[PDB]
């Protein structure tokens, strides 16, 4: 018999993104080639099958630095990290291939699905 | 020119609640009288003006235990912690006074607003 506040989840995500922009309570650095991205492990786990597996590992859960596979493009990762914290995906003709490849590696099934759909249309 | 995934924020919150139920990456214990509640500092901050102030404090940000004011009712806190992680509020005739008082202390303005509305109706 609960009542529900429709905007609650969106407002929570908006505040988590504000914490990220201000580097508040970030507990991990994701290294992608020469580029570094600060984030919250819980948000990464909630969005990605790969980060979920990494941070549930009894040894990796305690690492402050995670290095991604050298094939991963920093821009594709940046676009996906922004999507994790906002629900908004900056999908463009020039980045769609790098975004799909990064989403497949990160195990972000809904992003992979829209990339396959957008590629099929063209 | 971004696209948006409508269910993303709700899915993120659902996964954060799953992490909470399994006690994964919880980094704080909230003590309410004899009762203890494990949670994620970032989720508490995203939902509550009080926790936002506590965990942005250069000294309190590093505490693993936070003791609430002894006037705070553990059931009211439990109902509000559940709302933080689900968007669902278990508001009942028998708990509405304790829920409103706890939401005022935690600075959860939308919960305070619906409690005032529900009290006014009766």
């Amino acid at each position: 018999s609960c009542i529900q506040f429709t905007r609650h989840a969106s407002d929570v995500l908006l505040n988590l993104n504000r914490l990220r922009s201000r580097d508040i309570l970030t507990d991990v650095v994701i290294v992608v080639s020469r580029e570094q991205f600060r984030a919250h492990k819980t948000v990464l786990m909630a969005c990605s099958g790969l980060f979920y597996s990494i941070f549930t590992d009894q040894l990796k859960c305690n690492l402050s630095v995670i290095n991604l596979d050298p094939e991963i493009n920093p821009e594709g990762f940046c676009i996906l990290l922004d999507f994790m914290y906002t629900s908004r995906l900056n999908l463009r003709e020039g980045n769609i291939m790098a975004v799909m490849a990064t989403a497949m590696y990160l195990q972000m099934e809904h992003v992979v699905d829209t990339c396959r759909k957008f590629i099929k249309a063209s | 020119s971004c696209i948006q995934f409508t269910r993303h924020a709700s899915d993120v919150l659902l996964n954060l609640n799953r992490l909470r139920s399994r006690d994964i990456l919880t980094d704080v214990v909230i003590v309410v009288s004899r009762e203890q509640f494990r949670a994620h500092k970032t989720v508490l901050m995203a939902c509550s003006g009080l926790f936002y102030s506590i965990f942005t404090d250069q000294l309190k940000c590093n505490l693993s235990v936070i003791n609430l004011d002894p006037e705070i009712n553990p059931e009211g806190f439990c109902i509000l912690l559940d709302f933080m992680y689900t968007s669902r509020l278990n508001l009942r005739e028998g708990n509405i006074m304790a829920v409103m008082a706890t939401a005022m202390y935690l600075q959860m303005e939308h919960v305070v607003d619906t409690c005032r509305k529900f009290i006014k109706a009766s």
Partner: peptide, 4 residues
């Protein structure tokens, strides 16, 4: 607020 809604009835979910």
């Amino acid at each position: 607020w809604v009835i979910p």
